[PDB]
C-alpha cells in the first residue's frame, strides 16, 4: 500500500488541474502537507515563495504538495485552490484535516509537513521556515 494512506482515505483521489491523481500516482516522491486557507494574511505571504519553489524543483527533486484546507466553505475552498499548481483533498474530508491537525500538532498556518510518499515516514515539519532560508532546496527534503 502506499505510505500516504496512513494518512488520508485510501480510496480517495486527490484534487487537481488536470485530473484526479490517485495515492498511489505519488509513489516514489516526497510529499508535503500544505495547511493553509483563504483569509489568512501570513499564508498569502507564503504561498507564493513556496509556489516559486514548486515551479523550479518540484520535478528535478520529486516531490508534491497537497493543500489540506481550513477554509470555511467550499467555496473559498475552490477559488483558494484554483490559483495553485498542486494537489488538494478534497474539501468534503473535513473529517481528515482535523486528525491530521492532531497527529502533526499543527496549532496554526501555515504549515508545511514533509512525508515519503512510500513508507509514511514522516522527513520534518518545520519545512515552512527551511524553504525560506534555503529557496533552493539544498538541504531539501530538511530531516527534522
Not at 505571504?45 to 513556496?50: K, M, N, Q, W
Given at each position: 500500500m502506499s505510505g500516504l494512506a496512513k494518512y488520508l482515505p485510501?480510496?480517495?483521489?486527490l484534487l487537481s488541474k488536470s485530473g484526479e491523481?490517485?495515492?498511489?500516482?505519488?509513489?516514489?516522491?516526497?510529499?508535503?502537507?500544505?495547511f493553509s486557507a483563504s483569509w489568512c494574511p501570513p499564508c498569502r505571504?507564503?504561498?507564493?515563495?513556496?509556489a516559486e519553489f514548486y515551479e523550479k524543483h518540484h520535478v528535478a527533486k520529486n516531490f508534491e504538495v497537497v493543500?489540506?484546507?481550513?477554509?470555511?466553505?467550499?467555496?473559498?475552498?475552490?477559488?483558494?485552490?484554483?490559483?495553485?499548481?498542486?494537489?488538494?483533498?478534497?474539501?468534503?474530508?473535513?473529517?481528515?484535516?482535523?486528525?491530521?491537525?492532531?497527529?502533526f500538532g499543527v496549532e496554526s498556518i501555515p504549515t508545511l509537513i514533509?512525508?515519503?510518499?512510500?513508507?509514511?515516514?514522516?522527513i520534518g515539519t518545520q519545512a515552512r521556515t527551511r524553504v525560506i532560508e534555503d529557496p533552493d532546496g539544498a538541504n531539501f527534503p530538511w530531516p527534522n
Open positions: 485510501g480510496a480517495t483521489n491523481v490517485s495515492l498511489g500516482s505519488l509513489v516514489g516522491k516526497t510529499v508535503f502537507l500544505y505571504g507564503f504561498t507564493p515563495v513556496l493543500l489540506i484546507s481550513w477554509d470555511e466553505n467550499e467555496s473559498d475552498f475552490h477559488d483558494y485552490y484554483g490559483k495553485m499548481p498542486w494537489l488538494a483533498l478534497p474539501f468534503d474530508q473535513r473529517s481528515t484535516v482535523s486528525e491530521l491537525g492532531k497527529t514533509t512525508i515519503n510518499a512510500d513508507t509514511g515516514a514522516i
